[PDB]
Amino acid sequence: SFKCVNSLKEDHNQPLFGVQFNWHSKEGDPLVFATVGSNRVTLYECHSQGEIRLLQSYVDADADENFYTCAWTYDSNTSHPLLAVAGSRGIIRIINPITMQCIKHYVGHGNAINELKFHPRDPNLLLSVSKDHALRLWNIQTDTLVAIFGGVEGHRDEVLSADYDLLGEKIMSCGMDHSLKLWRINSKRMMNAIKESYDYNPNKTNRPFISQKIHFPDFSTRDIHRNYVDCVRWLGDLILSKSCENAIVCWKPGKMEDDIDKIKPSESNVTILGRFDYSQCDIWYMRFSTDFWQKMLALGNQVGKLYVWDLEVEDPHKAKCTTLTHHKCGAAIRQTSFSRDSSILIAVCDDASIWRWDR
Ligand SMILES: CC(F)(F)CN1Cc2cc(C(F)(F)F)ncc2-c2cnc(NCc3c(F)ccc4c3CCO4)n3cnc(c23)C1=O
């Protein structure tokens, strides 16, 4: 079980929209997590007796910047951790977490970036989702835009979230148009574009890097939720997604026995395997998270209550729920993050507060 061992508050007093533990931290090193809020990203180290040590922040030059998301990766030659952040300005910043120096930046999205995710098998492939209705896949080793996922049959409104499956062969995205869209990235076209992005060196060529424009998803559905879908994650071949209807739905494209890789773009069926209901969620922009092994699922509500579901059961609908409450924790929890070993759960709130729960 989890016990609340410490709380903290950031000086800006603005909501904290994101929190991510670094799952790429070396053995023996303390557990480190990043928070994003206001025009700032801050790093903290978790220590014994619930101590949370403040390290260093990156503060954006523009006081009007709002960071909405962050994600960790590592430098592909040195293994040193790297941190990517993005928000309202639509600029992806790659930060060296040691010195908090901005190493490089990527621009292209016509609007705010709602989420960043790194590929589970390739530390150089970064996915960004934006208010301009599109997803973008970048290669941060060669600084190239590999592909833009959107267009004529892509999202019709702001994209809120996206996730890669286990092998990083497909992406599921969701947003304000109420839809969930599947984009396969293991096609011959996408694997060739990724290979070409690695061979690109502008000092050694005259051509610009040609980005793929993917106008058609491999699956699309609006039958899961009746409002904006603001968070989606894969659970194997299954999908977990949530709207503002006080529920996380567990579902899969097609009929019960349909294989996810046999699903065609014209597939009109979905199968609901369960729904995890919870209380008091009226506001938009809340994220749920799973731990490294996907044994647990966590989500906070608008009054500081934490729900943790145990996914180590035969079928999704049998998930066991545990609730975590503290008399002082009363603001909306925007995101949670588990440490790689699942021994620590951090929750971040609307009042700039950070809450630590240890098993
Ligand atoms: C005038 C304005 F600043 F632009 C208003 N905001 C800022 C804002 C204000 C407030 C409040 F006032 F209540 F504190 N709440 C939410 C947002 C906000 C938050 N997070 C994203 N994106 C990331 C994102 C996501 F896409 C899906 C789930 C999710 C998150 C973060 C945590 O969970 N935002 C994108 N646009 C806004 C947000 C926005 O329009």
Swiss-Prot record:
Start and end residues of each stretch annotated as Interaction with EZH2: 1-359
Gene Ontology CC terms: chromatin silencing complex; cytosol; ESC/E(Z) complex; nucleoplasm; nucleus; pronucleus; sex chromatin
Segments annotated as WD repeats: 11-54, 62-105, 108-148, 154-195, 224-261, 279-319, 328-359
Keyword Repeat among record annotations: yes
Gene encoding the protein: EED
Recorded domain comment: The WD repeat domain mediates recognition of trimethylated histone peptides at the consensus sequence Ala-Arg-Lys-Ser. This is achieved through an aromatic cage encircling the methyllysine, and involving Phe-17, Tyr-68 and Tyr-285.
Region of interest (Required for interaction with the matrix protein MA of HIV-1), ranges: 69-223, 221-359
Function: Polycomb group (PcG) protein. Component of the PRC2/EED-EZH2 complex, which methylates 'Lys-9' and 'Lys-27' of histone H3, leading to transcriptional repression of the affected target gene. Also recognizes 'Lys-26' trimethylated histone H1 with the effect of inhibiting PRC2 complex methyltransferase activity on nucleosomal histone H3 'Lys-27', whereas H3 'Lys-27' recognition has the opposite effect, enabling the propagation of this repressive mark. The PRC2/EED-EZH2 complex may also serve as a recruiting platform for DNA methyltransferases, thereby linking two epigenetic repression systems.
Annotated tissue distribution: Expressed in brain, colon, heart, kidney, liver, lung, muscle, ovary, peripheral blood leukocytes, pancreas, placenta, prostate, spleen, small intestine, testis, thymus and uterus. Appears to be overexpressed in breast and colon cancer.
Modified residue annotations for N6,N6,N6-trimethyllysine: K117, K188, K204
N6,N6-dimethyllysine: residues carrying this PTM: K117, K188, K204
Stated induction or repression of this protein's expression: Expression is induced by E2F1, E2F2 and E2F3.
Keywords: Acetylation, Chromatin regulator, Chromosome, Disease variant, Host-virus interaction, Methylation, Nucleus, Phosphoprotein, Repeat, Repressor, Transcription, Transcription regulation, WD repeat
Modification comment: Methylated. Binding to histone H1 'Lys-26' promotes mono-, di-, and trimethylation of internal lysines.
Primary residence: nucleus
Compartmental location: Nucleus; Chromosome
Oligomer status and interactors: Component of the PRC2/EED-EZH2 complex, which includes EED, EZH2, SUZ12, RBBP4 and RBBP7 and possibly AEBP2. The minimum components required for methyltransferase activity of the PRC2/EED-EZH2 complex are EED, EZH2 and SUZ12. Component of the PRC2/EED-EZH1 complex, which includes EED, EZH1, SUZ12, RBBP4 and AEBP2. The PRC2 complex may also interact with DNMT1, DNMT3A, DNMT3B and PHF1 via the EZH2 subunit and with SIRT1 via the SUZ12 subunit. Interacts with HDAC, HDAC2, histone H1 and YY1. May interact with ITGA4, ITGAE and ITGB7. Interacts with CDYL. Interacts with BMAL1. (Microbial infection) May interact with the MA protein of HIV-1.
Name of this protein: Polycomb protein EED
Family per record: Belongs to the WD repeat ESC family.
Disease tied to this entry: Cohen-Gibson syndrome: An autosomal dominant overgrowth disorder characterized by accelerated osseous maturation, advanced bone age, skeletal abnormalities including flaring of the metaphyses of the long bones, large hands with long fingers and camptodactyly, scoliosis, cervical spine anomalies, dysmorphic facial features, and variable intellectual disability.
Effect of mutating I113N: Impairs interaction with EZH2
Impact after mutating L116P: Impairs interaction with EZH2
